[PDB]
Structures are given as C-alpha cells and as structure tokens.
C-alpha cells in the first residue's frame, strides 16, 4: 500500500508537524542565522580551498583537508537551499523537490563526517596519490549513495505507520541507520585518536567539536525512532543549525595549527 498521490500537507498532517503558512519571528530568526552560517561556511571553505590550491606547500593530508573543506562547502550550499524553503515556503514543495532538499543535506553531512574519519585514519597512519584519491572517491561514493538511498527505496512512501516524526517520509530504519553510522564513526575517531595519544589540546578540541555539534542531533534522532511521546520536534530547527555550525568550525579547527596556513591566509 504505497501513496505518492498525496502532497506535503497530507504527510505533515499525518505526522505531528506544523506547516506554518504565515511568517514568524522564530522563522525570520532561523532564516537570518542559517543564511549567516551558510555565508560563513561558503566564504571560509572557499578561502581554505583557494589556499590549499595556491600553495605547492600543501600539495595527501592537505588533499583530504581540502576535500573536507569542499564537503563543508557543499553542506553550506545544501543548508542555504534548505533556507528559502522553510516556513511558509515549505508549503510550496512537492515530494520530489522535498526529497531533493533532504538528499542534498544527507549527502553533504555524510561527506563531512566521512572526511573527518578519513583525516583521522590518515593521521593514525602517519603517526604517492593512490590511497588519498581512493579514500576521496570512497567518501564521495558513500556520501552520494547515502543521500540517494532514501530518495529511491528506503522511505515510508509504502509504510505510513512506521516512519519518523520529523522527516515525515524518511523511515525509523533509515534514521537509526544514519545515526548508528555516525555514532560508530565518532567512536572510531575516538579510538584512533586515543591510540595516537597513547597534542592533547588538538585531540580534545577535534573530538569536542564533533561531540558538541553531533550528540544533540544523534540523541534527538534516536529519541524520535525509539521513544513514543517524547516531544522531540521542539529542538529540531536549532540542532540542525548546530550540525551545520560544525561544518562552519571545521575549516578553522583543521587550519589553526598550521602557522604556514595562518601566514598563507591573504
Ligand atoms: C534527513 C535526515 C538526515 C539525518 C538527520 C539530520 C538532522 C540533524 C540534526 C537536526 C535535524 C536533522 C534533520 C531533521 C529534518 C530536516 C529539517 O529540515 N528539519 C526541520 C526542523 O524544523 C524542518 O524543515 P522544514 O520542515 O522547515 O522544511
């Protein structure tokens, strides 16, 4: 029993979500903060890629740093397009277009997370251009397939009853998958960096950015998929902004230590 016939209104009304036909103080506030964060991400990551390409000094570690910067740039673009599509604007959507929006978000953040794990793995190995391009194509292939799987097959077009409260169309199975994927990625980063340490400031801030910008989102998604009657829609719009603020901080987290890169920035 599968229904692509209904519009977004049917799916929201099925769920607990609110369409927000009219503009709001909260809607204007989140639009302003989101556009600010997106402008910051785009500018900062454009600067990082320009530097990593202008200097022959940063010609594999800096390739993975620039790949992380490009994924964060894509996250900025995805979040920028998600804005100018919220509040009353969401009411103008269709199933295909809304899936476009959420798929861009999925692939962008998955690419950012995979680049963080790849930089951790390279740092572990360090402690030609073959392994670096192999891991870049693995990161991008995994990001695209992860952002496309719900857009094709893995969503609640067919089970209205069994899917999420926040994403009315993604399923509890997909949200559990994404969140456990991110959780195991974070524990792999923690074990790699702890083994490396066994420097403390760099490790703590690198893990801390990730924990304070993801644990909110991941615990929120697990609550949505596990606990009924846990009012979890309330703190969604700001937790996504925190997840994008992670990609905002990544360019200065992974470029502050390099005095050469600091001198480069011009
Ligand atoms: C697609 C799932 C990927 C995995 C989770 C991503 C994530 C992380 C941290 C906070 C939130 C999320 C997504 C939550 C839904 C996406 C959205 O845009 N929600 C907002 C919540 O107010 C409504 O968007 P809209 O209804 O205004 O279009």
Author numbering: 23 to 81, 83 to 150, 160 to 230, 256 to 323
Give sentences from the paper.
Lysophosphatidic acid receptor 1 (LPA1) is one of the six G protein-coupled receptors activated by the bioactive lipid, lysophosphatidic acid (LPA). LPA1 couples to the G proteins such as Gαi, Gαq, and Gα12/13, and transduces various intracellular signals, e.g., increased Ca2+ concentration and actin reorganization by the Rho/ROCK pathway. LPA1 is widely expressed in several organs to control cell proliferation and survival, cell–cell contact, cell migration, and cytoskeletal morphological changes.
The binding site consists of a polar recognition region on the extracellular side and a hydrophobic pocket within the transmembrane region. The head phosphate and glycerol moieties of ONO-0740556 are located in the polar recognition site. The phosphate group also forms a hydrogen bond with Y34N-term, and is tightly recognized by the positively charged resides K2947.36. Moreover, the nitrogen atom in the amide bond forms a hydrogen bond with E2937.35. By contrast, the long acyl chain fits into the transmembrane pocket in a bent conformation and forms extensive hydrophobic interactions with the receptor. Notably, the aromatic moiety in the middle of the acyl chain is sandwiched between two leucines, L2786.55 and L2977.39. Furthermore, in the acyl chain, the C14 carbon forms a CH–π interaction with W2105.43.
